[PDB]
Write a protein that binds this ligand. Structure first.
Ligand SMILES: N#Cc1c(N)nc(N)nc1N[C@H](c1nc2c(F)ccc(Cl)c2c(=O)n1-c1cccnc1)C1CC1
Length: 808
């Protein structure tokens, strides 16, 4: 009956749905019911979409941020093809018109009823864009390859759609009773408790009295906080810290209001988390491992049945140079003038608001409702934990509904990490991400994997697991599509684990050939084959080419899997790298910013030929990396293999000879250009992000000439082989070196004008717990490298010195 789906979901998300049931939590069950109908209604909307509107859902256009061109078009039934000549100028419609003209004038006698599919890929060319704005065409024009498209009728598209369906009174001081506990340590135990409105204290913390090490201690000590109960904001969370003293032990937080605005009472057991001193950013749900978690019971006094006031009761109630408390007063001040004439300074007004005073809040929340929507940029800042308030969040999400699916896609990683700053399961952000994920399958694809990859993490396991379940209710088909991806990753791990065992007992060629025998098994063939790339859902992974597969002799023995597509031709020759043992989250992040840099640069006419390859964690220290084909490490090139076309008299020539071998005579001129531009781009990206530990074996170069970085283990601060290529070999070519210096400088200014975009995004990534990005000013390096507390003309003066430092 309907049980297969629930089992499929359980397997997919990696946790039984019976486990959600076993909680007997009304919040959990109200989420699973509210979001289910939400996701089900979204699925109903989908099946009504026009066949073009449905293409947008399943196959979102992948675009770029006079010139003739060779196309190859074939139809569905017959494998017969036609080769036209169109311009990069032309729309897809004019091409489809040509497709019909040649078809009719050979079969013997309407473009609007068709869509061009990219052969052997989950991509479609449509809309009123010139062909060169499509990234498949732009790719073909960069490799000299010929686009191979396919005329698909609207009738068979509709067949796909159908195939893929289914009280201000309480003035007393706030108090709690610290009863007993159960711990482990050598001394004296003590309980520090603090009230927080996010990253700020509502009042000063209070500690318990010292109670000794052995036990199972007890206090029964009533803790009174310097704040009244009618002044606790809606997002008041009480944060307990426990440590030994003559040594940290455990911490735990919780909201002083339940998920229905009711004031918390009376007794609650707090299963604490290990520590490292208070941690308000931490989760407000207990350590799931009750079997071994240090516990802390407390008592919240009754005070009557008190809810938090509804919104309709909150109804009640020079500067400029600032853009100190006397200053803070001079930005609390004319509250109304900010809204009236400085709407985009809301964030600075929201943190001068006295959140420990219900009136200063109600007056702030009054302005917020009449507040005009802000740009996407300002909204990304309001999402941070330093704006924890209930209504500030909704205002931020309200100002992100104008996000384009390509904008949302660029930021989706950060929006997902913010989910950890939440206090309740049902939020505006979750409802927003699910809504967008269900309207764009590409968003939904990466929403799923970003959540699935962290299901091994106890603190987010419940939330992320529930979000995915909800999403699955909204797409029965993608779940099955994602199941196939999971099943492939499952065998990739088993294969990798075997390769780890085998290479310890024997050598590479024996393990490689026995690796191949493992892959040749039916269960492995019918699992690694015919799936959408988790790295890129539009990229299809059809036939696994076992003979071409292998592994690296690193310590983690990462796998090298190649594919081929009996349709896509050369576009179907693609590979993926399976890695198990390392954390690939920071690598994905760096590649997300380099991609952004590439977009920002491209959105001003600067194409530095960057290679932002795919990187996706899929599980615990498990992820995938897109193979950049036709490339090689500088190490292997400068190694200077004997009697090979890079045979050089000097080490300085090993690279330029390698290019000359791959780029004959006149084709070289463009290879030097690809190199110079890609070099400049990654020099800047390296500098801005502070990517360290660079050397000949983590820098790679494409046969096109494009150089690109790999292996991003450390960032944010934690040679005349390029100059020789850039200068064409000539010892003195200032004109060709100054143009490189030119590329770098302009590439740096463009990022500075968008420095706040990178800033806010990294501030949201603090929620990831990346070792290299966790301190509340690890982001300092980024502000320095970008010189953001400063203007352009002289930032390109400071940028100069370091360029001259790196030059010598
Ligand atoms: N990251 C990355 C990345 C990437 N996206 N695309 C390519 N093409 N290579 C990349 N990394 C290279 C690389 N990585 C591998 C891997 F990870 C797993 C399995 C294998 Cl069997 C290899 C492999 O053979 N190489 C390699 C070495 C020497 C020459 N050419 C390739 C650099 C590390 C040696």
């Amino acid at each position: 009956v309907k049980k297969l789906i629930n089992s499929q979901i359980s397997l997919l998300i990696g946790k039984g749905l019976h486990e959600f049931d076993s909680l007997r939590d009304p919040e959990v069950n109200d989420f699973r019911t509210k979001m289910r109908q939400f996701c089900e209604e979204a699925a109903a909307h989908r099946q009504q979409l026009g066949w073009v509107e449905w293409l947008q859902y399943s196959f979102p256009l992948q675009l770029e941020p006079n010139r003739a061109l060779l196309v190859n078009v074939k139809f569905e039934g017959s494998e017969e093809s036609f080769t036209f000549q169109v311009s990069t100028k032309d729309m897809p419609l004019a091409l489809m018109a040509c497709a019909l003209r040649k078809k009719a004038t050979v079969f013997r006698q309407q473009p609007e009823e068709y869509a061009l599919q990219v052969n052997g890929r989950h991509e479609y060319l449509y809309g009123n864009y010139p062909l060169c704005h499509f990234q498949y065409i732009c790719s073909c024009l960069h490799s000299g390859l010929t686009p191979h498209l396919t005329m698909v009728h609207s009738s068979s598209i509709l067949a796909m759609r159908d195939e893929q369906s289914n009280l201000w009174s309480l003035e007393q001081p706030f108090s709690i009773e610290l009863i007993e506990g159960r711990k482990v340590n050598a001394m004296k135990l003590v309980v520090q408790a603090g009230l927080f409105h996010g990253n700020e204290m509502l009042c000063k913390t209070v500690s318990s009295s010292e109670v000794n090490v052995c036990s199972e201690p007890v206090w029964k000590q009533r803790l009174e906080f310097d704040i009244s109960v009618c002044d606790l904001p809606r997002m008041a969370r009480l944060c307990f810290a426990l440590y030994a003293v003559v040594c940290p032990i455990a911490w735990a937080n919780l909201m002083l209001f339940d998920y229905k605005d009711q004031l918390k009472t009376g007794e609650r057991c707090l299963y604490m988390w290990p520590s490292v001193l208070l941690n308000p950013a931490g989760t407000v749900r207990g350590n799931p491992n009750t079997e071994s978690a240090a516990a802390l019971v407390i008592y919240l006094p009754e005070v009557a049945p008190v809810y938090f006031p509804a919104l309709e009761k909150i109804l009640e109630l020079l500067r400029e140079i600032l853009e100190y408390e006397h200053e803070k007063d001079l930005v609390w001040k004319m509250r109304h003038e900010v809204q009236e004439h400085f709407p985009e300074a809301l964030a600075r007004l929201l943190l001068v608001t006295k959140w420990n005073k219900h009136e200063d809040v109600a007056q702030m929340l009054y302005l917020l409702c009449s507040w005009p929507e802000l740009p996407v940029l300002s909204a990304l800042e309001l999402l941070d934990f330093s704006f924890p308030d209930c209504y500030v969040g909704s205002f931020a999400i309200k100002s992100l509904r104008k996000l384009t699916d390509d904008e949302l896609f660029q930021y989706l990683l950060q929006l997902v990490q913010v989910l950890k700053y939440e206090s309740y399961l049902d939020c505006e952000l979750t409802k927003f991400l699910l809504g967008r994920a269900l309207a764009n399958r590409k968003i939904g694809h990466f929403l799923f994997w970003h959540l699935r990859s962290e299901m091994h993490v106890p603190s987010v396991a419940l939330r992320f697991g529930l979000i995915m379940e909800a999403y699955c209710r909204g797409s029965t088909h993608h779940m099955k599509v994602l199941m196939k991806q999971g099943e492939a990753l499952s065998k990739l791990k088993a294969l990798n684990d075997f390769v780890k065992v085998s290479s310890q007992k024997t050598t590479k060629p024996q393990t490689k050939e026995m690796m191949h025998m493992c892959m040749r098994q039916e269960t492995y063939m019918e699992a690694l084959s015919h799936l959408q790339s988790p790295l890129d859902p539009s990229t299809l992974l059809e036939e696994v080419c076992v003979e071409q597969c292998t592994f690296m002799d690193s310590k983690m023995k990462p796998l090298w899997i190649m594919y081929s597509s009996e349709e896509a031709g050369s576009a179907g020759n693609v590979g993926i790298i399976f890695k198990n043992g390392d954390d690939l989250r920071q690598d994905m992040l760096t590649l997300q910013m380099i991609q952004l840099m590439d977009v920002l640069w491209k959105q001003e006419g600067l194409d530095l030929r960057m290679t932002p390859y795919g990187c996706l964690p899929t599980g615990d220290r498990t992820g995938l990396i897109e193979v950049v084909l036709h490339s090689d490490t500088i190490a292997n090139i400068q190694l200077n293999k004997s009697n090979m076309a890079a045979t050089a008299a000097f080490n300085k020539d090993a690279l330029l000879n390698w290019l000359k071998s791959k780029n004959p005579g006149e084709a070289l001129d463009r290879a030097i250009e690809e190199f110079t531009l890609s070099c400049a781009g990654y020099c800047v990206a390296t500098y801005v992000l502070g990517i360290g530990d660079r050397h000949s074996d983590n820098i790679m170069i494409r046969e096109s000439g494009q150089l690109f970085h790999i292996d991003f283990g450390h960032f944010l601060g934690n040679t005349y082989d390029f100059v020789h290529v850039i200068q064409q070999g000539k010892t003195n070519n200032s004109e060709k070196f100054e143009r490189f210096r030119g590329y770098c400088e302009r590439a740096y200014t463009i990022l500075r004008r968008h420095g706040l975009l990178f800033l806010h995004l990294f501030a949201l990534m603090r929620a990831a717990g990346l070792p290299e990005l966790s301190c509340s000013k690890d982001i300092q390096y980024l502000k320095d490298s970008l010189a953001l507390g400063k203007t352009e003309e002289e930032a390109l003066k400071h940028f100069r010195v370091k360029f001259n430092e790196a030059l010598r």
